[PDB]
Amino acid sequence: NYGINLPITGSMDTAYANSTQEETFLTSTLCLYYPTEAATEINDNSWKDTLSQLFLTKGWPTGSVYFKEYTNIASFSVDPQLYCDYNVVLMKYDATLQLDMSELADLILNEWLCNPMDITLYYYQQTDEANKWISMGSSCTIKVCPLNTQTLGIGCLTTDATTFEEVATAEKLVITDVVDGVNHKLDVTTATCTIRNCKKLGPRENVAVIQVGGSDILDITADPTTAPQTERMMRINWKKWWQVFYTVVDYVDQIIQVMSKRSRSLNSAAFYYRV
Amino acid sequence: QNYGINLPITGSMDTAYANSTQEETFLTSTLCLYYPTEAATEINDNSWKDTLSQLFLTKGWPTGSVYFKEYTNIASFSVDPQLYCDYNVVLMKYDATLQLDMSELADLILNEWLCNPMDITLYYYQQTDEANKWISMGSSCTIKVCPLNTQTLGIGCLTTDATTFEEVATAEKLVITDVVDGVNHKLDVTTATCTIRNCKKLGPRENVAVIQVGGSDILDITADPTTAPQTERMMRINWKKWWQVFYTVVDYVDQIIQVMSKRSRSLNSAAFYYRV
Amino acid sequence: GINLPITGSMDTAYANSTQEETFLTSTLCLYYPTEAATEINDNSWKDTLSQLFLTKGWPTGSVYFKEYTNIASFSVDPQLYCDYNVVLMKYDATLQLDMSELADLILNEWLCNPMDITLYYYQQTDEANKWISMGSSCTIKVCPLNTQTLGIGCLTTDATTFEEVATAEKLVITDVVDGVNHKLDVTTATCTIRNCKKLGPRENVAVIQVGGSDILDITADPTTAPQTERMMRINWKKWWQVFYTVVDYVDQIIQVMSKR
Amino acid sequence: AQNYGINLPITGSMDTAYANSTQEETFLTSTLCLYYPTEAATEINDNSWKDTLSQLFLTKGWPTGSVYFKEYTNIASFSVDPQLYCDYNVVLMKYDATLQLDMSELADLILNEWLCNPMDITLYYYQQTDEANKWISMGSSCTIKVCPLNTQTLGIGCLTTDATTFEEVATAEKLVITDVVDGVNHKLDVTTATCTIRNCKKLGPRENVAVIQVGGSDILDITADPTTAPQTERMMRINWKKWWQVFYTVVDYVDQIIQVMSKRSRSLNSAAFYYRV
Amino acid sequence: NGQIINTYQARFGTIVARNFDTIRLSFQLMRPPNMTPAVAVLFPNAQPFEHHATVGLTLRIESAVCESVLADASETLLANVTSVRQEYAIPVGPVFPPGMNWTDLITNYSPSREDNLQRVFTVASIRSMLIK
Amino acid sequence: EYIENWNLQNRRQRTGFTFHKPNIFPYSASFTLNRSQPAHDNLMGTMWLNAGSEIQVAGFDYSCAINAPANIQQFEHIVPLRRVLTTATITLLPDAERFSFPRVINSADGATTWFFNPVILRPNNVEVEFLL
Numbered sequence A: 001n002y003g004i005n006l007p008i009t010g011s012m013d014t015a016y017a018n019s020t021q022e023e024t025f026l027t028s029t030l031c032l033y034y035p036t037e038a039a040t041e042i043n044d045n046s047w048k049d050t051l052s053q054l055f056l057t058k059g060w061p062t063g064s065v066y067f068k069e070y071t072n073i074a075s076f077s078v079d080p081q082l083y084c085d086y087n088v089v090l091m092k093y094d095a096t097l098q099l100d101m102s103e104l105a106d107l108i109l110n111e112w113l114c115n116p117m118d119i120t121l122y123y124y125q126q127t128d129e130a131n132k133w134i135s136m137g138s139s140c141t142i143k144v145c146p147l148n149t150q151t152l153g154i155g156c157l158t159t160d161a162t163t164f165e166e167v168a169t170a171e172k173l174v175i176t177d178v179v180d181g182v183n184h185k186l187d188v189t190t191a192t193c194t195i196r197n198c199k200k201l202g203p204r205e206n207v208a209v210i211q212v213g214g215s216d217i218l219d220i221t222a223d224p225t226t227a228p229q230t231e232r233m234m235r236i237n238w239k240k241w242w243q244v245f246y247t248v249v250d251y252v253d254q255i256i257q258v259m260s261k262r263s264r265s266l267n268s269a270a271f272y273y274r275v
Numbered sequence B: 001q002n003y004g005i006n007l008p009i010t011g012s013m014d015t016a017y018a019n020s021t022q023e024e025t026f027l028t029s030t031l032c033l034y035y036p037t038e039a040a041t042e043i044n045d046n047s048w049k050d051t052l053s054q055l056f057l058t059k060g061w062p063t064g065s066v067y068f069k070e071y072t073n074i075a076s077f078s079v080d081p082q083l084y085c086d087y088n089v090v091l092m093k094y095d096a097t098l099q100l101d102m103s104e105l106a107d108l109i110l111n112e113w114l115c116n117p118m119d120i121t122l123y124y125y126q127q128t129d130e131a132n133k134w135i136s137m138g139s140s141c142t143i144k145v146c147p148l149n150t151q152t153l154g155i156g157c158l159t160t161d162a163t164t165f166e167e168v169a170t171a172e173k174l175v176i177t178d179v180v181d182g183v184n185h186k187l188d189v190t191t192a193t194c195t196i197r198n199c200k201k202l203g204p205r206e207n208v209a210v211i212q213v214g215g216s217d218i219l220d221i222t223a224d225p226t227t228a229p230q231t232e233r234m235m236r237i238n239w240k241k242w243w244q245v246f247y248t249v250v251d252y253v254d255q256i257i258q259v260m261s262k263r264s265r266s267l268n269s270a271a272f273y274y275r276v
Numbered sequence C: 001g002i003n004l005p006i007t008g009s010m011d012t013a014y015a016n017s018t019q020e021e022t023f024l025t026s027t028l029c030l031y032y033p034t035e036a037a038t039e040i041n042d043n044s045w046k047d048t049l050s051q052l053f054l055t056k057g058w059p060t061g062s063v064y065f066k067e068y069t070n071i072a073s074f075s076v077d078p079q080l081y082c083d084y085n086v087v088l089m090k091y092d093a094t095l096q097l098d099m100s101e102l103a104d105l106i107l108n109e110w111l112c113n114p115m116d117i118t119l120y121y122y123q124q125t126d127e128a129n130k131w132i133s134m135g136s137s138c139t140i141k142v143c144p145l146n147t148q149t150l151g152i153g154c155l156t157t158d159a160t161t162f163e164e165v166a167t168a169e170k171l172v173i174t175d176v177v178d179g180v181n182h183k184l185d186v187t188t189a190t191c192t193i194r195n196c197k198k199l200g201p202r203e204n205v206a207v208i209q210v211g212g213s214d215i216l217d218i219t220a221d222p223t224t225a226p227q228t229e230r231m232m233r234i235n236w237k238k239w240w241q242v243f244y245t246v247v248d249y250v251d252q253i254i255q256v257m258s259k260r
Numbered sequence D: 001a002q003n004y005g006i007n008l009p010i011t012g013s014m015d016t017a018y019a020n021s022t023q024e025e026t027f028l029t030s031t032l033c034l035y036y037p038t039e040a041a042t043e044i045n046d047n048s049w050k051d052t053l054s055q056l057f058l059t060k061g062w063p064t065g066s067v068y069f070k071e072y073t074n075i076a077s078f079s080v081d082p083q084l085y086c087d088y089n090v091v092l093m094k095y096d097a098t099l100q101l102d103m104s105e106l107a108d109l110i111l112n113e114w115l116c117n118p119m120d121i122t123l124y125y126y127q128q129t130d131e132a133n134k135w136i137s138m139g140s141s142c143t144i145k146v147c148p149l150n151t152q153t154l155g156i157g158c159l160t161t162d163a164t165t166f167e168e169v170a171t172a173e174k175l176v177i178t179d180v181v182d183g184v185n186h187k188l189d190v191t192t193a194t195c196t197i198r199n200c201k202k203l204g205p206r207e208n209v210a211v212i213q214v215g216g217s218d219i220l221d222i223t224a225d226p227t228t229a230p231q232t233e234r235m236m237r238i239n240w241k242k243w244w245q246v247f248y249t250v251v252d253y254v255d256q257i258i259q260v261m262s263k264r265s266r267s268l269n270s271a272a273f274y275y276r277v
Numbered sequence E: 001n002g003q004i005i006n007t008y009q010a011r012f013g014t015i016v017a018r019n020f021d022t023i024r025l026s027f028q029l030m031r032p033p034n035m036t037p038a039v040a041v042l043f044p045n046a047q048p049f050e051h052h053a054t055v056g057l058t059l060r061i062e063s064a065v066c067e068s069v070l071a072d073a074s075e076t077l078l079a080n081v082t083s084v085r086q087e088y089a090i091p092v093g094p095v096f097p098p099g100m101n102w103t104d105l106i107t108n109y110s111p112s113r114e115d116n117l118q119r120v121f122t123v124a125s126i127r128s129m130l131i132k
Numbered sequence F: 001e002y003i004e005n006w007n008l009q010n011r012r013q014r015t016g017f018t019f020h021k022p023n024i025f026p027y028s029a030s031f032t033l034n035r036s037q038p039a040h041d042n043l044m045g046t047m048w049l050n051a052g053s054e055i056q057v058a059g060f061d062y063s064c065a066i067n068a069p070a071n072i073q074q075f076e077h078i079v080p081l082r083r084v085l086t087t088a089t090i091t092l093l094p095d096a097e098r099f100s101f102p103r104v105i106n107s108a109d110g111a112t113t114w115f116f117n118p119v120i121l122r123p124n125n126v127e128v129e130f131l132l
């Protein structure tokens, strides 16, 4: 495949294909993430059986639709894994974790190229808008001290650690954006947190986001200027979860249609270590 | 540019060969050696990483590029071997008892597996063809496998009783279960300490070499009996002191990296097939 | 083995896959050690395996299982008479010559002749001429002979001075020097030993070795240790997976065998 | 009968008739030596098994005095100074399972031509030029400790004055073939009282000797290189129950064992001034 | 024949090309370095591009002198040839495309097809002199 | 013959030069990888030698169509000519001899080399078409 450089021509007068959507159903898998509050309100032992029997009539085979359960958006943010061919996430909204859904969908909806960071030795910087520092763990307290040309902290002291400028405080997953082109010093608690210098590639398109409730409050881009609403940012107003699950299983043919299984990554992870 | 679709690639058979660029391969990439945790007991040093990195400096690698990692044994390295750097090479002891488990770890390490999840309670399971396996990793995997006929009745087993199932794995860190293709099976995976996974090999993994240290030369990395290909990347060395093994690796860095390619899935050009 | 030329021609059409018709009209036979069925400890495991063979195109009445106790007890008289025979041989590190000479008896085809040791003296004429002994205890003492019928390093009357090549072994394949006659002291109370000659190898039976690294030097010379297409060997922890691997890959195992 | 050190290009036709059999004259002219461990002559139970074998070699074609028998106690004591004498050599060695580098280093000496220079450890720091340079030490008890220097004669992980800070690549071994990294000057701590170490260069294979591994699996790694484990024509292995089968097999197949070896390329008159011995 | 006969660098309107058999258009898209706020919202640095940059050219040969016969918007000779071949229900022969497809005739414009086309166009010009 | 064809083409009539093994093909020794990767251990595509009057083509698959549909891999090789040949006697043999022994070959960009160890099957379903 490695000769990507040769262009493909094609023609504007050739015939359309014969609707390769039913053959997409047979040779694919589908994992829909649901919070544990769903499985509390569901009140069934064999509701995966009921739903999978309903997925059978949509064109899927039996052994294709799996479900995976997470506790909340904070615990899913620790190490989110995308296991199968088409992933959709069902996330319940509240106004508190307003940023913890924006940065979670920032991690989930894009392909990230992450590299490790040894903050105890080296001084790191960000090259352009594309990279961020994405840090995950059970508790991340990130304190960033900016330096100058002479390796001296501006408005701070390099030696003392209490004069630092904290960016995050006791957070499961953080996406820090700092000033590009300035060497910085870190106080990430490495016992419970790993921070990674990580560039943003193109978006991952096997996973869609279903904000169950609330308002249209989500962004990918960390600039204030652009707050894009992509084709797989979608939202549902809820009263019971059964309307939500029946809504998902009814409109499978529309939800896959805004996704692409070509963006499978061979690993369930989300960060592409050591390129 | 132009990812996705496959293109035919033509080229003249009288094009001039390029330069050596083994220099640039060493000066660009990384390297990761994997030794068992008892090796540093024989080594008797706390500053032999500092020593050996200066030894790797001679053959073109810079200081902070060759990386050293540990593992306790071949069983607990098989719990989750996560290899990612540009060139991985693993040094494993030859245990005459742990013959299959070394072959299992070699089958995991030397091939690339597309991997789908599994739900033991919910569905009934079958394998499509010869490249389809059930890879289960964890603290203790005990797998019992119950075949079913065309009407989902138990063949030699009873789907109610988990005792009458047919036991294929018992308290093993890493299992690659191969059953007959085309028969629906029911499972008894203890999912509290284990995780089974429907995987499918796309091809070999090329950024890892296996150096087994001692013993006789074979790791059966294929399922079938009728072949067991000794590939170019598995290899064997003899030992009395570990220092001779480490010095032999540091000497023949050039040949060991020569027999290992750049892992096609890393490359930009193979982006939207299976890894960017 | 024909010797009248079959001409044939190139550029003629490849026939269709007769592998299915091979499956419908043959008999496949496993040979397992007793310790396998000891760990298996099922009373109807032949049923579940035979139905798994029925999945892969073999009919119902076409797969047979026959035990053997160990490699020593299989080598006293192995009967291989199905259309496709495979054996499952445990690897013992101590029983290393015995696996080699067993697979020599099993994989190759031998034309044998009797051997009355009291009445005659016996030389090996060919390279391919060997002496094959079966029974319960084969104490084989062989002394060479000059041209003038005198013992070389033994007394040709006294049996203590002889030179033994086998001490109470079930199967022994004895190779002595060619062109020299020999006086023999086999124990014919238990052991029957014959003058055999190697024909072309038996393409009926395959050997799945089950255990350690390869040892099989089935050729009598030190020069060649050829690993043929049927010296297969899987590694193992559980016996159930050993049978599931055979049932899955019947196409690639029948593919490297032929009928008799 | 001349031009001994020039390496002239020959020119041979591809229509030359094949010569005669030459095997009978090779059997009448040259000599054969058979090296066996002393456990063989223990299990053989004879004083005159040498004459019994020699008359069987007479049947095979060799004369009476052309087949010489020497022995050794174990692989470790044969490996103290292997000096292999006559025109065709073949050695029988039993696979001890616990020693695997010993047999591979033994066949690394025996199946290769080694051009070796002396060493003085007290004076010089020694680097290896390329891959065929090895450091071969032999004696009663060798214990080699290597100290890698930098480009300033300062040890890397080793103090140049202390010998306990040194690291050992072998201890208490009869023969050691040491391979270290090429281009780095090294300090040594060989016990020079009971061990002599020498600066060796592998010119090529030795053409007159085969090694028959009596029992035990394929283990032989000649080339101290992890990627290649070559299986040449003269690394034969057989399985044993009694030794008499081994001796009758090596006597029956003389015409194959002598065939897979040749005359030694150095020992000819034609290789006069290219390292003749 | 691979040689640059005429070249024109950033000149529009009517141009002239004296002798050619290949036309090479080399235009480039440059991102505008100064953009008003109505333009800067169109082209973000991130991935979702709802407005795609597009740069075009148009090249229309008004009149040309060709040594071989062709068809154009002035003559009606190809129309006369196709009218005669379609009026009398003529089978497809060895040279001309089925139905006198001019796209398939100028796609593979062989010299034998060139000779046939010139002969039949000359006879069509003769008949167009007599028959209106 | 040459002055006859000179005088016939001076009046624009049909000519023919009769050639024994004409040098109609330019020297083009190259290949094409329909399936390739940087490991170069599972390749698929054609190789060819166009020289003088001789085309030697060989399509290779490393998998021997073990995952192709119906265990059949289709190859194709299209050679355009520069001038139209007429009444050609052509020796068509199978089993191209030059691409039947092991060789190492530089890649398309000339960076690395890849190994080619062929075993030869006979060509199934040969279709040779002569397009005008």
Ligand SMILES: *[C@@]1(O)O[C@H](CO)[C@@H](O)[C@H](O)[C@H]1NC(C)=O
Pocket: C015, C016
């Ligand atoms: C096979 O191609 O040819 C056979 C005759 O040689 C015929 O009997 C058989 O039906 C054919 N099968 C197929 C699949 O075409």
Ligand SMILES: CC(=O)N[C@@H]1[C@@H](O)[C@H](O)[C@@H](CO)O[C@H]1O
Pocket: A017, A018, A019
């Ligand atoms: C007119 C007709 O029958 N059309 C079908 C079309 O619906 C289908 O997409 C295709 C399948 O490949 O086959 C065509 O023949």
Ligand SMILES: CC(=O)N[C@@H]1[C@@H](O)[C@H](O)[C@@H](CO)O[C@H]1O
Pocket: B017, B018, B019, B020
């Ligand atoms: C034209 C060409 O190939 N140039 C390279 C050159 O870039 C490289 O440094 C050199 C090493 O000596 O090898 C040459 O082949």
Ligand SMILES: CC(=O)N[C@@H]1[C@@H](O)[C@H](O)[C@@H](CO)O[C@H]1O
Pocket: D020, D021
């Ligand atoms: C003396 C000699 O070596 N030459 C003989 C030759 O005379 C004889 O015709 C041939 C028969 O095969 O055998 C060769 O060895």
Ligand SMILES: [Ca+2]
Pocket: A155, A156, A157, A163, A164, A165
């Ligand atoms: Ca501050």
Ligand SMILES: [Ca+2]
Pocket: A126, A128, A129, A131, A177, A178, A179, A180
């Ligand atoms: Ca930034």
Ligand SMILES: [Ca+2]
Pocket: B156, B157, B164, B165, B166, C042
């Ligand atoms: Ca059972």
Ligand SMILES: [Ca+2]
Pocket: B127, B129, B130, B132, B178, B179, B180, B181, C248
């Ligand atoms: Ca299978």
Ligand SMILES: [Ca+2]
Pocket: C153, C154, C161, C162, C163, D046
């Ligand atoms: Ca005696």
Ligand SMILES: [Ca+2]
Pocket: C124, C126, C127, C129, C175, C176, C177, C178, D252
């Ligand atoms: Ca014999």
Ligand SMILES: [Ca+2]
Pocket: B045, D157, D158, D165, D166, D167
């Ligand atoms: Ca040290």
Ligand SMILES: [Ca+2]
Pocket: B251, D128, D130, D131, D133, D179, D180, D181, D182
């Ligand atoms: Ca060296």
